[PDB]
Amino acid sequence: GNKIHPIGFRLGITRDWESRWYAGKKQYRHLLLEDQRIRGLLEKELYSAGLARVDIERAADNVAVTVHVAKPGVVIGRGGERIRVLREELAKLTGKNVALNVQEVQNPNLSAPLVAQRVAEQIERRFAVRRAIKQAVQRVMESGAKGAKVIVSGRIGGAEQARTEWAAQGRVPLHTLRANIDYGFALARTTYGVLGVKAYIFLGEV
Template sequence: MSRKKNSSSLNITNNKTWNSSWCIYNQEEFRYLLQEDLVVYSYIRSQFKNFELMNIINLRIYRINDFLIIDLAATYISFTMRELITIFLNSLSIFLNKYVYVAINKLSYLISIKNAFNIALKIAKLIEKRIKFRSKIVKTLIKKVKDNTRGIYVQCTGRINNVDMARVDKLYLGSVPLQSIKAYIDYAFVVANTSKGLQSIKVWVCK
């Protein structure tokens, strides 16, 4: 996003970057666009259950005049999902009174297996289905990541395996230098909602 003189720009971190790109010139416009961003994200989160199979990894919003463009990065897309997205866009366009478009980028297997958020989301879904953190499925997933990267480090916090006492469990393979500036580390944080409470999944992937 280009910066101009006497203009204000928004760059709030959410692990990495704020997922909106826009530039404003007065305080009133700043307040309006920020409120609209929060409304759009809240509405998208409420519809995420319908798009759960897509495994949405990244979402970014762009504005060009009166047009609102939603850029999605997903690992799976089907014809049924396209129909749901069309209905979603029509309802969002009526609500915001704007032209809303969506651009879907389907990630390849090699890119998705290196993505920390995708790995954390998969582990969280397995834990919500009452699969143990140190199960064979989770270890196989971590091994696949290690085969395509330098290393992976996974940390799970909460009432793991439905026990009464909260604790921290870790799984790691390969090398993940967290104190090195030269290393390219991809980090993600996902919360799994289980019958015993919330469990946090943190993943570090060294590419």
């Protein structure tokens, strides 16, 4: 057990807060809680799309919600009827009355959370783990970026023994509180147990 979360270790600099807004004292908790709820819905729904991150800004009964996807068309929908149900379904949950934006992902092949879920899926589809991995890695590696690295839990293949798979190219400096490394964790339910998927992606500098 080691290696702090590269994100939170960088929250001060090269990386920000998924929920930026103020309050406190007697609202925070209630308000904060409110966030887990949305993120709750957006995640169980906009999956097949590529939920990458969920920014949530606030200014008193006026939330933001800016879902990050790779295939925004799925979030949107036919002509945009589904961004009507979600946007509306979100209210039946929070009467705060908020909007909902959707920013496409510039080559999801560079979004940790995605580079992982990608892998995740493959695993659940019973795909050689060692490959999906080496595969994903090269992808990132091959789509710009100066460094990538994917890690997969144990039971790789339903092995009776809890193993670990590696693979990783370029530079990936988790200690350099400046590097600006994207992180992401994909869980992998499976007939033989649960497998965790970690993906780091290193982009430029500042």
